[PDB]
Symmetry: C3
Subunit: 334 residues, 3 copies
């Protein structure tokens, strides 16, 4: 009976091992000792996808923390999967991820993984289909359930804003800014210790509107998705890419913390190769060098053998080209 | 086939016995003889809840009218129930309530029983979940079906506006005012004889925004839900509560008709006790005295043995503490 | 698995026979040689309705093009049918219509066939029920699939705006204008060769708001639904109807292209007769004379034996009164 449906419960924070909160101070993330923190890690696939092949397990997290040097895992929660499993079930699985991550001393970025234009509720693909109401409700539920949980560090409000050349709507920064501020207000009303992560247009590549009209809230970080072909210099070299990246997203790191929550590549003739993830490999050192210089955090896309570009070729964790590259980088940084 | 789906019908007004319309005149409700009218009654549970236990029957209405002195029943129509039964079936059951009430000479308040912030479509619990579209459609259907039915006196547009400390959205009077005016306009387009009832924030407790920006429509009344702990004076007495109630909602009765569509209490250690319905009992005489002085109408929450705070302890209508208290008050007022 | 659902594909334009695009220039439609073009044709029923009785077939289009003189068919896509068949299946059937029409050298008007007020998402009947999100998605999908297809000439954004005497919402031209501009922008982003068709209030009858506040986009045309009883002169004659039609919709043809996407009549005591389609027959020559004089395009409602007013009495295409009349008119004009 509907009148017997219980009110929701909050995650039991006393079940967790000690773990520092991460907070925003100026243009940096810091831990509870004031030491500069950098999120360095990977995306995994949607929980529902992993469950379907029996790969949603602690052993996945252990492999990453122990053998790949990650301090962060990004969970891309697809709206279609949220609906298919249903909120109560999906949240129960996120609880498992919180416990596994906490046990390993690593952090989670929760990503509402849609692609398109939320103000008009039009999207790149139905797997990303959502509504303002559903998006608000997702964040209402998440914020309430994970109040005062250090393991869950970042709430990435909407993965990839895009109008696909204004076919989905008319991109308008003021309208998108206002909507992010509305989401932030709902979150901050319920938990002020979380870090909202806000994205610009062109699939979370273009942060340039924040130069004139930044989000008017404190404690936030900005996303960037600097895939190799987002910048298109006529001549491909460090100088030309750095200038282009500087103007579109890199500048943000001077004033706000930035997380490159998606990056990576595959050979142009490789598995699942498509624009804008095609590259000969020179991008890897280039993007790492740039991020290092700017102090930018990152989560590689994606630690999965099916979704591309892959970091692994199988569920024995055989590394792909980009996987082998980032594995060495992250292990050195740890 | 979808192209064969028939257009809706209206309630047959000729099936009803003679009953006066209630109308708004200034700060008062009046009957068709211009005599001041006060709604005095109770809430019952959602129709779907009552149906599930075979308690949706005329005998319920008869008990209330004959033995509890009510002239009004408030039906709190939960959106989840509206969806579960479906509009056509739910409306058929509301038709039954109209006939029963009309036969007894009593009135109905139809309440779109949601709790939360409609402009962002975020709510306290999924049982209240709705949308602006669904809310409009509810009032479109209701207004059409019950055109020119005196028995259905009041359309209470949205039970309890709240943002739950701005966790549901940013409370904003201007946007809420505009949305109520939109709903009123749809209703008045279809039936001008109905009384819309409009609520403020803090779970329909705070009417103070209407001092500066009242709804810009005539013929309306304002709701109040003055539960015992909504006002929180340091020292609990008549003087201190009256002052607080005056500033938040009582003042409205000087200019507009007011209906306290929810009120009541249970002991702090009693069944279903929670903030803000906890009280030692002194509230009962206090709220009745205040409403009497201001000429405020009321429907007690709730005449049900499960939902709290209860007016009855069972379906034999054994009165609870607050039930026994309000029963005597209403029976006296009916005289 | 949801992650394996493929991305959509576009119609194969190389499968089509040569056919001129139609474009807007000033107050006229023109072909690719700059010659003035007039859409002259009929509505058929919703694809889903036709499928249910096995009447969705090329032979329908052939009958119309060969024997009724049409150069245009309007497809009224009902939202309930779009949902029932589902977008992928419905689009597959529209692909059939594109091929059939193209093979015959005729054109299609795609009509999102709702009746009501999209800004509040309230409608005359559930078969028309939709949302802004669904309406946008329909046009997103259509525009992408039929990019660079000359056969599909017109995208009629929303069949019949009405608030039904403000029972559905408060009619507001600025709000409706803005929403049409938003739809136009999504379409033009994906295909600039299409012609959007925009409607006014009173069931797409009243274009008068465009005198002061026209849609601020180029390449658009305006719809009119001049059913016989939309204008109500005291004395029914050419002079009095022409004056009324001039003021409400005819004036638009002086500045913009106009398509009367619905028109027609049945005797007042005839099959499916209702306001505002009732007429003695004198309307037929009258509306044709008016349109001819103004250079207005048209699609008669409706070439179906069930939906009214009918152009045919059966699926052997036995003409009704209005069908016989318009058949002769269209056949002559095709010369
Ligand atoms: O799902 C099986 C199917 O998956 C394809 O992988 C897709 C990924 O490539 C895709 O990654 C994209 C991100 O989701 C976006 O945020 C970003 O803009 O673009 C990324 C790619 O550049 O994610 C989806 C799920 O969201 C995956 O379906 C494989 O490429 C394909 O081989 C396989 O059949
Ligand atoms: O439903 C089963 C569950 O019911 C609980 O009763 C609830 C009522 O206490 C509740 O009353 C509230 C109103 O609905 C609100 O408008 C108002 O803000 O506060 C009232 C007092 O809380 O209504 C809900 C349904 O809307 C009832 O479910 C019982 O407390 C519980 O024991 C029982 O199992
Ligand atoms: O479908 C079965 C039922 O259909 C009725 O036909 C209806 C048509 O008359 C109706 O046409 C209207 C248009 O849809 C509107 O755009 C316009 O304002 O008015 C037209 C005529 O009044 O369309 C609906 C479907 O949209 C049809 O149902 C038959 O008249 C009836 O006998 C039959 O049982
Ligand atoms: Cl964009
Ligand atoms: Cl509130
Ligand atoms: Cl209208
Ligand atoms: Mg946290
Ligand atoms: Mg009434
Ligand atoms: Mg075209």
């Amino acid at each position: 009976d509907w009148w017997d449906i219980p009110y929701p419960s909050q995650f039991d924070v006393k079940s967790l091992k000690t773990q520092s909160f991460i907070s925003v101070k100026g243009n940096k993330f810091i831990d509870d000792k004031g030491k500069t923190f950098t999120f360095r890690g990977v995306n995994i696939a949607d929980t529902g996808k992993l469950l379907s092949r029996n790969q949603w397990q602690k052993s996945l997290f252990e492999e990453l923390a122990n053998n790949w040097g990650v301090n962060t895992i990004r969970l891309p929660i697809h709206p279609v999967s949220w609906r298919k499993l249903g909120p109560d079930v999906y949240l129960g699985h996120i609880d498992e991820a919180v416990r596994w991550a906490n046990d390993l001393g690593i952090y989670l970025i929760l990503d509402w993984h849609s692609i398109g234009y939320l103000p008009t509720e039009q999207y790149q693909h139905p797997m990303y289909d959502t509504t303002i109401k559903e998006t608000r409700d997702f964040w209402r539920r998440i914020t309430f359930r994970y109040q005062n949980v250090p393991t869950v560090a970042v709430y990435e409000l909407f993965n990839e804003p895009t109008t696909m050349g204004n076919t989905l709507g008319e991109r308008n920064w003021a309208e998108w800014k206002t909507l992010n501020e509305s989401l932030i207000d709902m979150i901050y009303a319920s938990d002020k210790t979380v870090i909202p992560l806000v994205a610009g247009f062109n699939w979370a590549y273009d942060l340039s509107p924040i130069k004139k009209a930044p989000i008017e809230r404190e404690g936030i970080a900005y996303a960037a998705h600097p895939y190799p072909q987002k910048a298109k210099p006529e001549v491909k070299n460090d100088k030309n890419f750095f200038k282009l990246w500087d103007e579109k997203w890199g500048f943000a790191a001077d004033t706000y913390p930035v997380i490159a929550t998606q990056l990576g590549w595959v050979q142009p003739d490789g598995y699942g190769a498509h624009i804008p993830v095609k590259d000969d490999g020179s991008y890897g050192p280039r993007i790492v060098k740039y991020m290092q210089k700017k102090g930018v955090s990152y989560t590689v896309w994606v630690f999965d053998p099916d979704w591309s570009p892959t970091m692994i070729n199988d569920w024995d964790f055989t590394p792909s080209e980009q996987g082998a590259f980032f594995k060495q980088v992250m292990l050195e940084a740890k």
